[PDB]
Design a protein around this ligand. Sequence first.
Ligand SMILES: [Cl-]
Ligand SMILES: [Cl-]
Ligand SMILES: [Cl-]
Ligand SMILES: [Mg+2]
Ligand SMILES: [Mg+2]
Ligand SMILES: [Mg+2]
Lengths: 242, 258
Amino acid sequence: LTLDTRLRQALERNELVLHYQPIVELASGRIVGGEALVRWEDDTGLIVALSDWVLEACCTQLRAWQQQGRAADDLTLSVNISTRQFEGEHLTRAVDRALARSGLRPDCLELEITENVMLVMTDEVRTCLDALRARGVRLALDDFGTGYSSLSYLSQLPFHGLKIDQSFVRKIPAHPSETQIVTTILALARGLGMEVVAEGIETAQQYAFLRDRGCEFGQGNLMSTPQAADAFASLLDRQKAS
Amino acid sequence: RLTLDTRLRQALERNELVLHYQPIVELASGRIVGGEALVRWEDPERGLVMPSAFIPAAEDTGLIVALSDWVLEACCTQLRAWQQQGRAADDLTLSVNISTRQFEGEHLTRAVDRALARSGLRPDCLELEITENVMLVMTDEVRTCLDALRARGVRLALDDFGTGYSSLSYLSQLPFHGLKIDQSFVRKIPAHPSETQIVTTILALARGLGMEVVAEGIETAQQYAFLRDRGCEFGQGNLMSTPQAADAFASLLDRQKA
Ligand SMILES: [Cl-]
Ligand SMILES: [Cl-]
Ligand SMILES: [Cl-]
Ligand SMILES: [Mg+2]
Ligand SMILES: [Mg+2]
Ligand SMILES: [Mg+2]
């Protein structure tokens, strides 16, 4: 409760900032995405309020980079959405508000929803996901492999992408179990027309394993830790010049 | 009029339960390589009663453990009978449906050991089918039973697959040799693109994890070919054979031997 207290005060006082972790096209090395991650610089209502802020902040940041000629047309940014945000009407409203104020092209925004959303899959959740899809926003399943999936729902739901959990990526290719989980996820995604981001790439062996198996995308401290907006935009600049 | 519980207890003491067996076929050859044991109640008052009509009541009162143990023993005894008669080939196994309630107190380990000891059946000839949603109730006790059974050489498959929830990390870590695609999906392929996609997804999962697949509910030649062409190893369904009384099943084994 003391932790929620601190976050509330941080929100009230505007003491939060987004950092962004580059998401790279493994074959080219091109930064094509970035996961927005909340940092503090020193209750469902709190989740909702934080997400409203994150959504607007992230969409505004990308729109700003586009207008300054720093973000290429292929750059998208991703925001993490809690399963707890599907209660009521608020998520679709928050996304609509962020897009309206920023003027951002909706397919520039991607929402990362943890796998265990499938465990709370009600009619209201399915309807929310369809509503979000109808707006042109990209949807990804996050932490994939660590939660629970219905193979029927996975085959039906409008997710364009999956993110392989870091806990598996960090153990390949040495460990058979984690390695077969990763290669299975890649095969699933291929048949479902989903793109895959491998989260938590730490070593060059991991990068190379993943690339040589058609894993589209990667993110990890190997390439870049989460970066402040200005540091992230520097990477975009160097890439544009290259 | 007696309660269903009273009548079920009487069915056990009066030997009114029976097993039927549905052939499991290797798609590539058309060979019967297995059989799923399926309990019925030969109810003197009603005829051949299906488990949907009594198993829920068994579960309400915990009679399900005694009932499932009866099934396990009867199945092991039957396979041993066919083996001794020379009618069951060396590759033949039979599969028994297990209730998640059997894991309680690690009962299942003792129940399987008893069934094997009473029948003399080798563990490598017995397969167990546990519903996919066992993954939502995965405790150290369940994991202990599963590891014990794999250690014995008893093969383990996930039943009703696609109608429940799976953890990819559990599918990898747990000793499941196979899964069985639910008939509700297979029944509708390729005509219904949604069900067809579900089947394709499950096949990719199983192949990825080195698991064998039985597609249940195969009703048409087109479905048989769809699955076979996509490397699904085994099948079960009305196209090949409905569930059969023991003597009927054994006759199928006799025909195949020729
Ligand atoms: Cl049964
Ligand atoms: Cl039934
Ligand atoms: Cl023997
Ligand atoms: Mg994320
Ligand atoms: Mg995770
Ligand atoms: Mg079964």
